[PDB]
């Protein structure tokens, strides 16, 4: 005597109503087809967990109940949950609908909002309390809404929102979530799944969002089926499918890996999702580039591999740019490369001052995966500009207090060039800035800033470094071999995250790093001073970045994990105290 459970990922994307209903139908045709009796569907996956202020539209909500209702009737002879946003009298909550038989049960509304780091669920919805039920009527019926518990088939299940009962009794616990994806998190969320199914000694499924969603926030679909303390079934994470389902029958980790497989989904949904003609890159022979280019041949590869030729290059919306002569070229690399020099196209871009040294490395590498290799001079353009500057200044520009200027105009002066590839293209340029250079300004506003993407402005650039390495070593990347301010040796690193993810003074992110090593206290004071200085006087650029993927345990972008002061003290009086 056993009962089939289950639980499915969905690819959404904001109020994209055809894409999110159609992966919710094709999920529950899925589970149907296996005799699934429960399914587990993600948090708001009928709306899509980020669409932001449109959740305080009246008309949002008002469509995703009329979808509801609707996916209920293809809901026969099975239990499915669905989540939206809904709203009562004026105030907005975070709601899961739970069907069964083609009949809607009731509503759970989410108890615990997050509102810290990277979420702002406050803005738009309003708590539920606990051990509440009121009712809700739609059309002229009454359903349980709030806190409720369901009497199903053969269980009695319980929802426990992501963020978010034993003592009542409940045989199966749902966990629809929208959990992004961050290094480790899915190590932590099993102990919390597994313990869950042993303190409430009864079935458990999680089932997350699968994708880049809305831009920033990757989510890695995972979806886990645990019982009484043990992990009964889990699917494979990061896919590159509209829908992941598994299901079980029940009786009565790396972060070099974790971050390939999140970037590949990453920029793969977001290259498609904006409609983008592949990718625009300009390849400086420097880690940063090449760590971008990697990135877009990993893509191509893993998605043409678990989707295939037709599905992979209809997915991506450039079927038509290929001939197909395709899918019979060997051995799959072949296709690869043809891929490729459609996605990606990169540019070396010299001055007199290149040395064919970073060439040949740039060279090499876009050769190695197929990417279109062009190369020219900015030199003419650069030389004309710093000619007429020293003009209208009437005199003339040196590295003696001109420095930062001249230092300025070579990544400026490849800027409106490689956008005109871009445009020409109606590709999609990337930026190349991680998230060290992030911290003191290091990148050139409106230089090497210039772009519509920055896919490793999340991660540190001790990371890049490990990354990179690992990258030639497993993905069988050699075009690497060569690749072999910012403080060096991990001081920036250790202090970016003792500051900003640790939320220490300076004061005491000096006194952290004096007992751990290895520098004196005058080069701690030094550095530590710089980076706050520097910190201050660059959150204006921060505040400019393209969008960028998250992927640590923080980030920097204000628009996200960090809101920090455009103007501020420049922490004068923090700084003052390392000394006195």
Not at 83 to 100: D, H, Q, S
Not at 413 to 437: F, H
Request: glycine share 6%; aromatic share 12%; hydrophobic share 40%.
């Amino acid at each position: 005597s056993t009962i089939r459970i289950g639980g499915a990922a969905v690819n959404q994307t904001p109020i994209d109503w055809e894409n999110n209903v159609k992966n919710i139908l094709d999920a529950i045709e899925e589970a149907k087809n296996a005799n699934v009796e429960i399914l587990c569907l993600p948090e708001l996956c009928i709306t899509g967990y980020g669409c932001e202020d449109l959740f305080l539209t009246d008309w949002v909500a008002e469509t995703a109940i009329e979808y509801c209702f609707e996916i209920a009737a293809s809901c026969t002879d099975i239990t499915v949950s669905l989540g939206l946003p809904m709203r009562i009298a004026g105030i907005t909550y975070n709601c899961v609908c739970l069907v069964e038989n083609g009949i809607v049960k009731g509503f759970s509304a989410k108890q615990f909002l997050a509102n810290e780091g990277v979420h702002y669920e406050t803005r738009w919805f309003t708590a539920w309390p606990r051990n509440h039920t009121t009712t809700f009527l739609y059309n002229d019926v009454k359903y349980p809404f709030g806190d409720v518990l369901y009497n199903v088939k053969d269980a009695r299940i319980g929802f426990e929102i992501c963020e978010d009962h034993y003592e009542k009794g409940a045989t199966l616990v749902l966990n629809p979530s929208a959990s992004h994806f961050a290094f480790g998190k899915s190590a932590i969320r099993y102990d919390l799944v597994i313990g869950g199914s042993e303190r409430f000694d009864c079935t458990y499924v999680y089932a997350n969002l699968l994708g880049n969603e809305a831009g920033r926030m990757i989510y890695d679909g995972e979806v886990l089926i645990a019982h009484k303390g043990k992990l009964i079934q889990r699917n494979d994470r990061l896919s590159f499918k509209n829908v992941n389902l598994i299901y079980a029958d029940i009786a009565t980790l790396e972060k070099e890996f974790e971050f390939w497989e999140a970037t590949s989904l990453g920029l793969f949904d977001y290259m498609r999702k904006s409609r983008s003609k592949g990718f625009v890159l300009s390849l400086s022979g420097g880690a940063d580039s090449s760590a971008c280019a990697i990135m877009v041949a990993e893509m191509i590869r893993k998605g043409l591999k678990e989707l295939g030729l037709t599905a992979f290059l209809q997915k991506s919306n450039m079927e038509t740019l290929f001939d197909l002569p395709a899918l019979q070229h060997l051995p799959f690399e072949e296709q690869a490369k043809k891929i490729t020099a459609v996605f990606l196209t990169t540019a070396y871009q010299s001055t007199r001052n290149s040395g064919d040294e970073t060439y040949t490395s740039a060279k090499t590498l876009a050769e190695s995966i197929g990417a279109t290799f062009y190369n020219w001079s900015v030199d003419e353009e650069i030389e004309q500009y710093k000619a007429t500057i020293e003009n209208v200044i009437e005199r003339p520009l040196t590295w003696e207090k001109d420095d930062i200027t001249l230092q300025n105009i070579q990544a400026r002066g490849r800027a409106p060039i490689i956008w005109m590839l871009t445009n020409v293209k109606q590709a999609l340029l990337i930026t190349t800035s991680n998230r060290s250079e992030g911290d003191v300004g290091y990148a050139t506003m409106d230089g090497d800033t210039a772009g519509g993407i920055a896919p490793i402005a999340g991660v540190d650039k001790d990371f890049i470094r490990s990354w990179l390495r690992w990258a030639e070593k497993n993905r069988n990347q050699h075009g690497l071999h060569i690749v072999n301010d910012l403080m060096p040796y991990d001081v920036l690193a250790r202090i970016e995250r003792k500051a900003i993810k640790e939320r220490l003074s300076p004061v005491q992110v000096y006194t952290a790093l004096l007992t751990e090593g290895p520098y004196t206290k005058n080069e701690f004071k030094y550095w530590v001073k710089k980076f706050f200085r520097l910190w201050s006087i660059n959150q204006w650029k921060r505040e400019r970045l393209a969008p960028s993927f998250h992927m640590d345990d923080f980030n920097i972008d204000p628009r996200s994990w960090y809101r920090f002061p455009i103007l501020s003290s420049g922490f004068a009086k923090e700084l003052n105290d390392l000394d006195q």
